[PDB]
Amino acid sequence: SKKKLRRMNRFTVAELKQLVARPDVVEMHDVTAQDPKLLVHLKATRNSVPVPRHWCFKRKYLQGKRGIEKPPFELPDFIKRTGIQEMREALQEKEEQKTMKSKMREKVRPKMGKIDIDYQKLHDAFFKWQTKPKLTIHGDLYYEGKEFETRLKEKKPGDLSDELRISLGMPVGPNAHKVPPPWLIAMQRYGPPPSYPNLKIPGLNSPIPESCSFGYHAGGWGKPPVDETGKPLYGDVFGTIDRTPWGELE
Amino acid sequence: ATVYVGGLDEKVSEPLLWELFLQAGPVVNTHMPKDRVTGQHQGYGFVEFLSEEDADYAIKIMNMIKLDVGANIFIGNLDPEIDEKLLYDTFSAFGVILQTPKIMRDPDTGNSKGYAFINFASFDASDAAIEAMNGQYLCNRPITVSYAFKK
Amino acid sequence: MGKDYIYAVTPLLEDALMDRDLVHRQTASAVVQHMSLGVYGFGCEDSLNHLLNYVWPNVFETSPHVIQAVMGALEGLRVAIGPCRMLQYCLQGLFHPARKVRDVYWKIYNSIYIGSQDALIAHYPRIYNDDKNTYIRYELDYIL
Amino acid sequence: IFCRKQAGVAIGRLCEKCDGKCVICDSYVRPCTLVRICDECNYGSYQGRCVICGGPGVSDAYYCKECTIQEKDRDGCPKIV
Amino acid sequence: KNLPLGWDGKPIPYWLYKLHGLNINYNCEICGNYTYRGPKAFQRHFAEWRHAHGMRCLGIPNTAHFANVTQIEDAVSLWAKLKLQKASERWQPDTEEEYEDSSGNVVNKKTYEDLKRQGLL
Amino acid sequence: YTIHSQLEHLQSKYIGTGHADTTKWEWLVNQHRDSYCSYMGHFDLLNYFAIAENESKARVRFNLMEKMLQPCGPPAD
RNA sequence: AUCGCUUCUCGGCCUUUUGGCUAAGAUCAAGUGUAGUAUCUGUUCUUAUCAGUUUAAUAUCUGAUGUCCUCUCGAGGAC
Ligand SMILES: [Zn+2]
Ligand SMILES: [Zn+2]
Ligand SMILES: [Zn+2]
């Protein structure tokens, strides 16, 4: 059987992985493809965009979204601001209460111009406060459940939030610098990361944030972690042109 | 690698949990796989920092981070510099807190003299917590905890 | 004059391209088609890129109306966003193991090719030459 | 189904039912360019007919401006025969 | 009957078992000759622990480049050429960064500082 | 499938299209021919090459149209 | 046995509950073409390899299911 001899040509995934110059790509079914050297060079080209997930799957595209409950669409700010939504809510409640007979009575004797919402409110929303939403650049196809995770890949340590500070016990605002969080405390106590560490903690492995305070009460920097010989735990826990665009509008 | 997120706070979201995991080291997994009914946090979670010493020091650091048959324990030499939710979470590592720590502070000012009492879940819970923190490292004035007196 | 309301409307189309139903995605795709043909040439290409990300997954589909509105969205989006971007979306699945995916990508690439076959000359990849053929284009990398 | 045997210089026409839409895009607006058909779907009893209805040629089939932006109007007699 | 579990811990019915194709087993040599039923199960295992451990003890990190390479000699030759390429594309100032002595002849950074601080340069 | 009568009429209509089985050889050779037809058409890449090598426009286009015949090696098998 | 509290069960009130009249006051109740999608609903699948067809891989489809004695597809053995 001839398909079966080409099937003996159907090399090993290790055959591929070792042959190829860029081995990240090589996947499962890659090998049953009539031209895997091409297929892999393509998939390893720049800027190209891989097939969706879901050609394998037996379930169709978002029949997996089937299960859940979902909250209605959330307007743009600059359209809420102009206060349309409340007009429409009010009209809704009115006409859900009114009864059939009164409905037809209003059909025959209309409440002409019940409401108003003036222009320049609209025209200023759409022409004076309209703003760029959040867009995703070339390549990042949406697949099922992708929104299931709001955002990521900020491995940075300094990244703090204000609700984070509040519900962790630390300060929000201009004091997010001079506030070493409750995790920098044990950073100073027993350290950062064993094999990660490429993060320095502010006031624990970094210097004083602007106008920090040394002391051992609540609200200070404490003992910047140092050896018995004086060298800090790492780094320095104590602390020791013309970018104008050419074509731009007035 | 695997760390028990104990006194796992209800609304303290797994997103900022993983952001603190990163702000400490290898944020590889932050998970509190909860009750199949509730959705809120289930008191103990798995936080994987893919480096063992990373998770070790991250744990030493993110401990104390501020996330009726006599099951009340007296806790003195008390740190006056704490908040309610943070103190409750610290006490709750070994049990529930059926009364947040009532700090016996003077009323003239609003600054404490260093004592409190806390209704935990169990008397063995007050035992274990008061044992691990008998004389041990409190915020500024070292802890001293045991079974509480009755007033 | 859609160059104004394109931003207002995008987060509603992305909303309805993450599933709600067949007809939901069929209709959001038609909307993308007409936005693209209106905003041809006014620079709102980041927004149509963003919506490509959401339309392209429906490429494997079966219902006639649904896949048809999808293909329409991709011709509109081809003039409005350019044929590089869409040749890159169509690169990897030309030579795929399967045959359902090979066939959809060759359907698309056929329609991308018929219209605007002459831009692509500067958009094709670099495809190395093995033993008994020559495949690189040295014409294009003469220095000067 | 399409004729598509290549274009010419003979204008097409519309019945009055079919009055107004583009030939393919099925629009109703902004028509820019006139339609041309082939000799073979030009001759005889097919002189001056509706490319769509088959009705009598009275109004002029036209090309929606989208169809001209994408040059889907450079293929020839699109008669559904 | 070997019927795989459901959430409610019963046999999975037969057409469904065939769909999921549990019959097919994958010899993962990295995982202690562990062998897997279910294909996506197999695949996720490459980032699952047992594979992670396998990697660590193999002496090669659990980076994606080897995922779906299950035999260990293949893994080591793969990571061998990978090592070679990483060392290549590293810019190493020791062998690249190069220094002329005063005498109109050139050496590298390393040898320059070597003979510099052992008393000539 | 009368759609297909029309569609392999389309394959017969546009030299350079494809179908799900198309081979790396047909693909890359068609793109290579198209590249040549446009180097000839566009009056300026012709100057680019004419000037890059030291040839002259007749020389240039004669080479190109000779190469147009087997540009990417001999065929597949 | 008596007193009190509680639990359950049962009986009795339960009019505290059918706005008056006439010619029962009178009368009566009328819609698509095409396909096709999706959703419900109903239903149907352990069998043992292997060969092929097939498929991205499964699957499907096709095809048979060690000899000898012997006793009751089953059994002890020379093998
Ligand atoms: Zn038209
Ligand atoms: Zn004709
Ligand atoms: Zn007509």
Task: Identify the CATH number of the domain in which residue B117 sits.
Answer: 3.30.70.330
Backbone angles phi, psi at D75, to 5 degrees: -120, -25
D25 annotated ligand-binding residue: yes
Q: How far is the CA of C123 from the centre of ligand 2 (A)?
A: 36
- Written as six digits, the tokens of D80 are 């559904």
Q: Which ligand is nearest to the CA of D67?
A: 1
Q: Could you list the residue range(s) of the whole structural domain that residue F19 is in? A: 11-75
**Which residue carries 């929000």 as its tokens?**
A172
Distance B129 CA to G2 C1' (A): 59
**DSSP assignment letter at D10:** E
Three-class secondary structure of residue F8 per DSSP? helix
Q: Which among D78, A44, D66, F10 has a CA at the least distance from the CA of C117? A: F10
**DSSP assignment letter at C140:** G
Q: What angle do CA E35, E36, E37 make, to 5 degrees?
A: 135
**DSSP assignment letter at A202:** B
Describe chain C by its helix, strand, coil percentages, rounded to 5. 65, 0, 35
Specify whether A51 is located in the same domain as A81.
no
Q: Does residue F66 form part of some domain?
A: yes
| Euclidean distance between CA atoms A154 and B16, whole angstroms | 11
Q: Could you list the residue range(s) of the whole structural domain that residue B83 is in? A: 73-147
| Euclidean distance between CA atoms E50 and E34, whole angstroms | 9
Q: How far is the CA of D57 from the centre of ligand 3 (A)?
A: 8
Report CA-CA distances (Å) from A162 to A171, A187, B66. 7, 21, 14
Q: Which among D13, D46, D78 has a CA at the least distance from the CA of D25? A: D78
B49 CB neighbours in chain A (<8 A) are: 193, 196
Yes or no: say if D3 and D78 are a contact pair by the CB < 8 Å rule: yes
C115 CB neighbours in chain D (<8 A) are: 70-71
DSSP C51-78: HHHHHGGGGS--SHHHHHHHHHHHHHHH
SS (H, E, C) chain E: CCCCCCCCCCCCCHHHHHHHCCCCEEEECCCCCEEEECHHHHHHHCCCHHHHHHHHHHCCCCCHHHCCCCCHHHHHHHHHHHHHHHHHHCCCCCCCCEEECCCCCEEEHHHHHHHHHCCCC
Instruction: Say how many CB pairs under 8 Å bridge C and F.
Output: 73
Number of domains making up chain F: 1
Yes or no: say if A203 and A237 are a contact pair by the CB < 8 Å rule: yes
The shortest C-alpha distance from C90 to chain A (Å) reads 8
Q: How far apart are the first and last CA of chain E?
A: 81
Q: How far is the CA of C101 from the centre of ligand 1 (A)?
A: 29
| Euclidean distance between CA atoms B106 and B113, whole angstroms | 7
Residue of F nearest to A37 (CA): F24
F21 CB neighbours in chain A (<8 A) are: 34
Yes or no: say if A204 and A237 are a contact pair by the CB < 8 Å rule: yes
Contact B65 A196 (CB under 8 A): no
Backbone angles phi, psi at E63, to 5 degrees: -90, 160
Q: How far apart are the first and last CA of chain A?
A: 74
| Euclidean distance between CA atoms E88 and E92, whole angstroms | 9
Domain boundary assignment for chain D: 1-81
Contact A76 C101 (CB under 8 A): no
| Euclidean distance between CA atoms B96 and B9, whole angstroms | 12
CA A198 to chain centre: 23
Yes or no: say if A87 and A117 are a contact pair by the CB < 8 Å rule: yes
| Euclidean distance between CA atoms E39 and E32, whole angstroms | 18
Other C-beta atoms closer than 10 Å to the C-beta of A192 total 27
| Euclidean distance between CA atoms A132 and A135, whole angstroms | 8
Yes or no: say if B126 and B49 are a contact pair by the CB < 8 Å rule: no
Nucleotides of chain G in contact with protein CB (under 7 A) are 36-39, 44-46, 51-60
Specify whether A82 is located in the same domain as A104.
yes
| Euclidean distance between CA atoms D72 and D4, whole angstroms | 12
Provide the edge-to-edge strand list for the sheet that holds B2-8.
B2-8, B43-49, B27-31
- Written as six digits, the tokens of B125 are 């819970």
Q: How far is the CA of E11 from the centre of ligand 1 (A)?
A: 57
| Euclidean distance between CA atoms A109 and A12, whole angstroms | 80
Q: Residues 13-42 of chain E: which lie with beta carbon within 7 Å of strand G?
A: 13-15, 17-19, 21, 23-24, 39
CA C13 to chain centre: 17
Q: Could you list the residue range(s) of the whole structural domain that residue A110 is in? A: 67-135
The shortest C-alpha distance from C29 to chain D (Å) reads 16
Residue type, F21: D
Is A63 (CB) below 7 Å from strand G? yes
| Euclidean distance between CA atoms D32 and D48, whole angstroms | 20
Specify whether A94 is located in the same domain as A40.
no
Describe chain D by its helix, strand, coil percentages, rounded to 5. 10, 20, 70
Q: Which among C41, C111, C51 has a CA at the least distance from the CA of C83? A: C111
| Euclidean distance between CA atoms C60 and C15, whole angstroms | 20
Give, for B47, the enclosing helix (H) or strand (E).
Answer: strand B43-49
| Euclidean distance between CA atoms A75 and D45, whole angstroms | 58
Q: Which among C76, C15, C86, C7 has a CA at the least distance from the CA of C47? A: C7
**Which residue carries 């602390």 as its tokens?**
A239
Specify whether A75 is located in the same domain as A114.
yes
Q: Which among C29, C52, C37 has a CA at the least distance from the CA of C3? A: C37
- Ranges of H-type helices in A9-119: 13-19, 36-43, 77-80, 84-97, 100-108
B32-35: Cβ within 8 A, 24+ apart: B32/B5, B32/B8
| Euclidean distance between CA atoms C21 and C27, whole angstroms | 10
Q: At what angle do helices F24-41 and F45-52 cross, to 10 degrees?
A: 90
Task: Give the method used.
Answer: cryo-EM
- Written as six digits, the tokens of E13 are 């019915």
Q: Which ligand is nearest to the CA of D28?
A: 1
Residues in CB range of C117: below 8 A, 6 or more apart: F14, F16, F34
CA atoms within 13 A on the CB side of A78: 18
Which resolution, in Å, applies to this structure? 3.3
Residues in CB range of A31: below 8 A, 6 or more apart: A10, A11, A12, A13, A16, C97
Give, for B46, the enclosing helix (H) or strand (E).
Answer: strand B43-49
Specify whether A21 is located in the same domain as A49.
yes
| Euclidean distance between CA atoms F17 and F10, whole angstroms | 8
CA C59 to chain centre: 10
Chains adjacent to B (≥3 CB pairs closer than 8 angstroms): A
